[PDB]
Amino acid sequence: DIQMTQSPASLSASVGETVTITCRASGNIHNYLAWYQQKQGKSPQLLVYNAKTLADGVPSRFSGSGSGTQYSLKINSLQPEDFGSYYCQHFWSTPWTFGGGTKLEIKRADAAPTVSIFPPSSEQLTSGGASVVCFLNNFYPKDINVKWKIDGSERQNGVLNSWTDQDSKDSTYSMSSTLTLTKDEYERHNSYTCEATHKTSTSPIVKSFNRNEC
C-alpha cells in the first residue's frame, strides 16, 4: 500500500561535493525509513535507519533527515568510495517497498558517443541468421536512445542492448546494440541504420550501411 518515490534516479557528483537524495513515501511512514548504499557488484549496506541514525561504520559525512513522508540522505564530503546506488526502504508497513534507487556517478564533461555499425559477418549469414551491431562508445551522460531502422522503417523487436558501467579511468559510458534478424529478412532489405539520440547533439548520430552497396 505505501510506495517510496526516490529522487533523483541518477545524480552526478564529484569528490568533495555535498549531495542529498530524497524519498517520498506515498503515505506517512513515521520515520520508519532506512537508506541503503549498494556499490558495484556488492550487497546493499545500511547507511542510515530510522530516518537519521547512522549505522555502524558509516562515517559522519552521511546525515539523514525527514518526517512523515519526505526524507533525505545527505553526504557531506563525497569521498571516492561513496559512489554507488542509494535505495531507501520504508519499513512502516507491508510491503516494505524500496525507492527506485539513485545512482551517484562521477561527474565529467559531456562526451558524445563514438558510434559504429557492423553488418552481419558472412559466417553468420551462413547460419540463416543476421545481426547488425552498433557500438556507441565512451559517452556521457548515460542517457542515450538507440533506434534501429530497416529501410526507414523503425524496428523495435530483435534489438538487444547492453551497457558497461561508468569507466574507471575516464568515467564515460558505452553501449552496444544488436538487431537480430533472420537471413530471409536481412537479404530482403538494404538499409540498416542505427540512430543514437544523446544529450550532446540535438539531432541523432546515425550510422548506416546498405546490404548490397558494397
Partner: protein
C-alpha cells in the same frame, strides 16, 4: 563475525521452481526478520517479502504473493525463497537479508538466478568488421559478437591480451534463453587492417577457445 551465506548461482528452466538457501552464522535468524529481495539485471531492489523466523509470520509484496513463498527452519538457521513457475522475469539476483528495525543489518552476497532452457552451448563468435565512415578518421573500432552461448561467462581478450586498452567488453544479455555479448576494440587506423587484430574469446563451460581475425568485409 556475522555472515549470511546464500546458495551459488542457480540455473532452472521456465515453468520449473527453485528454492534458494540463505544461511546465517554469527547470529540467530529469529532475532530479526529474514528478507528476500530481488534485483533484476541493472534494475532496482524489489522487496519480495520477509519471514519472522520466530513466528513463521510471512508478509509479501502482492506482486509476489503467488509467485513466491518464503519459509524458514530456525534449526539450520536458514531462510528460503521458493519461486514457482519460472518466467524469464525471474532472472535476477536474489538477496536475503537479516534485519528489522535497528542497526543490525546484514546482507548475503546474493544468488543469481537465471531462467533458461539452454544447454551448455559454445558461442558463435563472429568477427565484427566496420561500417567504413570511421575509416577516414584517426581510430577504427572493431568488435566481436560472441553469440548464442551458455552459460556465462566468457573472457574476450584481443591479440591475446596484447591489446589491453581501448577495449569495451559489454555485459552479456540473456535473450531467447541464450547469452550474447559483444566486445569492441579501438586501434589506430594504422594498426588495422595493416596489422592483425584478432579477438580471442574463451568459454570455459563448453571448453571452446576461439580466435577470430577481423578481416575487412567485402568493403
Amino acid at each position: 563475525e556475522v555472515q549470511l551465506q546464500q546458495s551459488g548461482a542457480e540455473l532452472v528452466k521456465p515453468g520449473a521452481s527453485v528454492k534458494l538457501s540463505c544461511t546465517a552464522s554469527g547470529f540467530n535468524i529469529k532475532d530479526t526478520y529474514m528478507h528476500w529481495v530481488k534485483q533484476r539485471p541493472e534494475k532496482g531492489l524489489e522487496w519480495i517479502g520477509r519471514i519472522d523466523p520466530a513466528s513463521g509470520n510471512t508478509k509479501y509484496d502482492p506482486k509476489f504473493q503467488d509467485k513466491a513463498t518464503i519459509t524458514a527452519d530456525t534449526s539450520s538457521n536458514t531462510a528460503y525463497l521458493q519461486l514457482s513457475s519460472l518466467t524469464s522475469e525471474d532472472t535476477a539476483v536474489y538477496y536475503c537479508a537479516g534485519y528489522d528495525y535497528g542497526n543490525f543489518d546484514y546482507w548475503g552476497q546474493g544468488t543469481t538466478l537465471t531462467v533458461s532452457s539452454a544447454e551448455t552451448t559454445p558461442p558463435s563468435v563472429y568477427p565484427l568488421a566496420p561500417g567504413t565512415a570511421a575509416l577516414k578518421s584517426s581510430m577504427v573500432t572493431l568488435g566481436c559478437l560472441v553469440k548464442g552461448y551458455f552459460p556465462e561467462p566468457v573472457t574476450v581478450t584481443w591479440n591475446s591480451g596484447s591489446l589491453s586498452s581501448g577495449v569495451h567488453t559489454f555485459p552479456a544479455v540473456l535473450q531467447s534463453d541464450l547469452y550474447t555479448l559483444s566486445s569492441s576494440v579501438t586501434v589506430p587506423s594504422s594498426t588495422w587492417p595493416s596489422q592483425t587484430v584478432t579477438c580471442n574469446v574463451a568459454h570455459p563451460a563448453s571448453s571452446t577457445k576461439v580466435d577470430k581475425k577481423i578481416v575487412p568485409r567485402n568493403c
